[PDB]
Write a protein that binds this ligand. Structure first.
Ligand code: HEM
Ligand code: HEM
Ligand code: HEM
Ligand code: HEM
Lengths: 146, 142, 142, 146
């Protein structure tokens, strides 16, 4: 990837405004409620029940937070994302066999949580740089052929 | 298929966004074109793809109009959107892969403006609505 | 939505594969498990994923039975496959992502055995049926 | 990618059996008939009409041939496909803006054309090798982020 100066700055700026625990927990719970099939990958968390059970799930909040810190790792290594995610790629493809549509479903939920928080500050241009970042991420998480 | 609770949530939102709808449509289209430049080829016949630009403004109105039709036809989107389906298949020939892109940009634009409406259960209803929309517009492709 | 043309093609196909059906399902399942190992997780409780192995043989009979069900209910697949949708949603929790993989593998298996039936126009009817199938089985996820 | 010996042999053996012109023309025709929206990318070909117009289209025939020759370049570069397809990736992403779902649609059509041609020879094992090849090629064609 090659990053524009604008792209590099707004990525750093977005993450600097997110409470990782707050946004992580909210993101993963959103994904598990809007796209219930994704629950299957997290069989050992707790309640496959109501949205309320997902919403108060402490294991879900925990893991949501872990995802955000994993994203922060890419933000700290913007020109070296593929290698930075090499072991996470092995985990998520080779071991867990996460259908890669799921990376996009989760990314889309993150985008919508960020949008809601940031408001009019989350302009088309800001969304463009965020989306390019998530594309780079999801590409480095997916099966590595190359 | 949308439940009657999904339908009521969608109609509730549609009522809330009344004064802002034409502007929601224009901004959502602006997002599509900048975030997903793939889609720019369908609007080559424009001049200035910024929101607030006259063509994007007026076409935003038109999209939000098709979505209002969809709301009126929420009980059978397949039948209600058949002419719009035919249009997007044969006159304009639009890759159906793009319907999900525009739906996402609409949900993103709505989130920036009405974030309080984006509870997880509401988002689920809206996402089911725009998925069924997209699937209705896909009906006439083959 | 399938045309009457699409429905007859699918029903005629389903006749022709009479004697071969159970073996077609066993081999299609073998194809899925080998070509797309993502799918092996759902059948961890097996032996022996080769075709001809008894669990694969018997479950291939079962899959083709669900599809002959779909054929008999081709007019309204949503209603006819509700029980199977619920089971694939809640009991087994199958990623909807995977319905297309199975369908692809069934079509591949068919083409090795009945190649003369795969004119582009027929393959188009079969694809529309299997897409409607998947969608019917996805109905009860949310 | 790491290829087993059976995989290299199998892929080379498949391509050795395909008439590129006949299989290409048939693959592209089938994609345009079964997934008719894919027609839009080839606006300058001829008839957007019946399946018979698609089937007799000489331009379609020609481009179908080109696709197969394109695949041959990966068969001849099996351990360096990404680099080989670098300009191809630019062309189909940056220039033509082909949604990447279409790469999989086309690859599935080719898989069905080859299955029809080869018959019982196209076993589950042989299909696995061919699908792995096509996955690597589709990823390489593939807007590239790394
Ligand atoms: C935005 C994309 C994602 C990022 C950056 C990410 C990051 C991470 C990280 C950092 C870990 C911790 C690895 C460790 O335990 O050492 C992890 C684990 C895991 N992730 Fe992801 N993840 C993402 C998306 C997904 C998706 C979509 C799913 C499934 C739908 C998923 C399922 C899992 C599972 C099952 C684990 C291991 C659970 C455990 O053993 O505690 N992840 N992920
Ligand atoms: C929510 C989904 C969509 C809805 C409700 C929708 C609705 C409409 C409506 C109502 C029109 C007016 C037809 C006319 O007056 O000529 C239209 C035109 C058009 N749409 Fe869509 N559309 C959608 C998605 C898309 C997408 C995703 C694209 C391409 C990326 C697209 C491309 C076009 C084009 C090229 C026109 C003709 C533009 C013009 O006449 O200037 N549409 N659409
Ligand atoms: C065309 C698509 C499919 C059809 C028609 C179908 C049909 C069926 C039927 C009829 C049954 C068992 C009902 C019974 O006799 O109790 C079943 C069970 C099952 N299906 Fe499917 N299925 C399909 C797709 C899938 C896919 C794609 C997967 C996973 C990748 C899957 C995983 C399972 C599993 C794990 C069982 C239970 C197996 C066992 O306990 O032995 N199915 N399916
Ligand atoms: C495995 C899949 C594919 C391969 C190997 C492939 C290969 C090629 C090659 C080798 C060319 C000619 C480039 C040149 O002249 O330098 C080309 C051109 C083209 N391709 Fe693809 N392609 C694939 C998929 C697709 C798909 C799915 C579409 C559309 C849905 C597509 C649309 C086009 C178009 C419009 C051209 C323009 C041809 C020209 O330069 O006149 N391609 N492709």
């Amino acid at each position: 990837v090659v990053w524009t100066d604008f792209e590099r700055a707004t990525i750093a700026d977005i993450f600097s405004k997110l409470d990782y625990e707050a946004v992580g927990g909210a993101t993963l719970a959103r994904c598990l409620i809007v796209y219930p099939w994704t629950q299957r990958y997290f069989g050992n968390f707790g309640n496959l029940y109501n949205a309320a059970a997902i919403m108060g799930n402490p294991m879900i909040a925990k893991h949501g937070t872990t995802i955000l810190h994993g994203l922060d790792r890419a933000v700290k290594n913007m020109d070296n994302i593929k290698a930075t995610y090499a072991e996470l790629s092995v985990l998520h493809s080779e071991k867990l066999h996460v259908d890669p549509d799921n990376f996009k479903l989760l990314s889309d939920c993150l985008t919508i949580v960020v949008a809601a928080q940031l408001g009019k500050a989350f302009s088309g241009e800001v969304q463009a740089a965020f989306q390019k970042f998530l594309s780079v991420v999801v590409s480095a998480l997916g099966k590595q052929y190359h | 298929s949308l439940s009657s609770k999904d339908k009521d949530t969608v109609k509730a939102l549609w009522g809330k966004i009344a004064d802002k709808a034409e502007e929601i449509g224009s901004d959502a289209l602006s997002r599509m074109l900048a975030v997903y430049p793939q889609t720019k080829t369908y609007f080559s016949h424009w001049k200035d793809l910024s929101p607030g630009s006259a063509p994007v403004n007026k076409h935003g109105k038109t999209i939000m109009g098709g979505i209002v039709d969809a709301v009126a036809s929420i009980d059978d989107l397949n039948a209600g959107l058949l002419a719009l389906s035919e249009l997007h298949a044969f006159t304009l020939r639009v890759d159906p892969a793009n319907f999900k892109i525009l739906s996402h940009c609409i949900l993103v634009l709505l989130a920036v403006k009405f974030p309080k409406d984006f509870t997880p259960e509401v988002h689920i209803s809206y996402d089911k609505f725009f998925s069924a929309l997209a699937r209705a517009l896909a009906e006439k492709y083959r």
